[PDB]
Symmetry: C2
Subunit: 281 residues, 2 copies
């Protein structure tokens, strides 16, 4: 299985024959396509489980959970597909799942139905970080959907921030050419040459994009259908683009981002190709 | 244009070269694949316009609007494609359209014309213009009002569809509900089960038909709620209850269960085919 092969090539721990990632290995696995396995896979010990407890115990509960965990944590393979589906699938399906797994419409599940959720997503021994975080140190607890959904949103925020620092190349701001590089990342070579013909010559360096403006673009990405039809209503210029994004997403967008995407896609915007490139990610 | 072909041979009025339906011609156009044009197309006169106004004045604003209108009203071609996509496309696009058209959560007549042009490519005053923008074309249409109009029209079409398959009566035997479900649809084995293991027991009420009809709109959520089982009647009823939010009468579930040999993918293949 290709997914499990990848999970294994990013796994640092092993026990009884089933490999485990660390939070650092998970972040590495979403952020880098490959990495040099310079060290063998050490086997799991009891200092590592106690480290799993301590890390949760001293980590932030928000957008810095996984980074604050560092190497103190464990993630099984099913939990890794689970987290992958948080980052790549819409959240309403999870609300449907919670409403089909809960007892007496309480919208709260215990640890066993969390196991069965990962079995269902999987086919489609020890206690891990997610079990200790959602449920008890000892399974004392049950996971309400509100808690779990703000966990999903926090993890998405985390991955967004680390993507920003990756394309900022460590610094606090992101030049508009690095935003253009990030937008056209999954585009093939031909179209990238056509767009880089535009950026190459008429995208200037002015302001540099903040993390919050990147996050604003990221919230605009989630309302692409409404925006797509609001565009199909149109001849489309910057005032009309800004209005269309403002009513299709509710979000005011920073002049740097609009300038960048307008000068990539050309005094009229080529929104057919713009949204074709967007929906590929 | 083939859609214009249909609109034209269902049209009863004409003017200046532009053909117009009455509300009855529209309903007939949604309910019957064909009809014999027995009468010629008449020229539009002023008694028809004042009849449109009066018909609007003495009609219900809810689920009986078009049937209460009868022949006293007119519907342009652009308005006919407009109403057709109201019945076959989701409604959120209309909300984004409204907020792309307003200066206030409200649209004027000019922007309604714009909307019928955009929906079209996707002189006289008609029924919809007088209803939304008044006799005088100077009113404004709030999105809530118009969404009430869409839901009321869908209710209307549901009621007339029920009366079509109930064949005039107040209740619908399970066999005619199966007739409606399998209309556009392996087809023999479905008809083998309704014939021998469907007990023409209770009859399906109109409200339970409407419940199934609104369940049809949450088919994706239901698909995931079904993929959670990885089979029985309580589990199917729970899945419909959380996928649509809404309790369903045991009568319909019995019918759909014995039609489809209680593997839900095939059932939803038949459903999403309409």
């Amino acid at each position: 299985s290709l997914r499990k092969q990848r999970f294994m090539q990013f796994s640092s721990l092993e026990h009884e024959g089933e490999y485990y990632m660390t939070p650092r290995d998970f972040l590495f696995s979403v952020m880098f396509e490959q990495m040099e396995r310079k060290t063998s896979v050490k086997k799991l010990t009891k200092k590592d489980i106690e480290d799993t407890l301590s890390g949760i115990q001293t980590a932030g509960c928000g957008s810095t959970f996984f980074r604050d965990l560092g190497d103190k944590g464990l993630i099984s393979y099913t939990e890794y597909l689970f987290l992958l589906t948080i980052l790549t699938k819409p959240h309403s399906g999870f609300h449907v799942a919670f409403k089909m797994l809960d007892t007496d419409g309480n919208e709260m599940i215990e640890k066993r139905e969390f196991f069965k959720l990962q079995k269902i997503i999987s086919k489609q021994e020890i206690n891990t970080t997610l079990q200790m975080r959602f449920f008890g140190k000892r399974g004392q607890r049950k996971l309400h959907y509100k808690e779990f959904r703000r966990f999903m949103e926090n993890l998405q925020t985390e991955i967004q921030e680390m993507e920003f620092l990756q394309f900022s190349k460590g610094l606090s701001f992101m030049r508009k050419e690095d935003f253009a590089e990030w937008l056209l990342f999954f585009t093939n070579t031909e179209n990238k040459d056509i767009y880089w013909k535009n950026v190459r010559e008429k995208l200037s360096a002015g302001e540099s994009i903040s993390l919050d403006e990147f996050k604003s673009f990221c919230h605009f990405t989630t309302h692409l259908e409404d925006f797509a039809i609001a565009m199909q209503m149109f001849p489309v210029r910057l005032a009309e683009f800004k209005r269309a994004v403002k009513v299709a997403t509710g979000q005011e967008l920073s002049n740097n981002i609009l300038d960048t995407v307008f000068k990539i896609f050309d005094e009229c915007l080529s929104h057919e190709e713009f949204l074709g490139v967007l929906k590929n990610r």
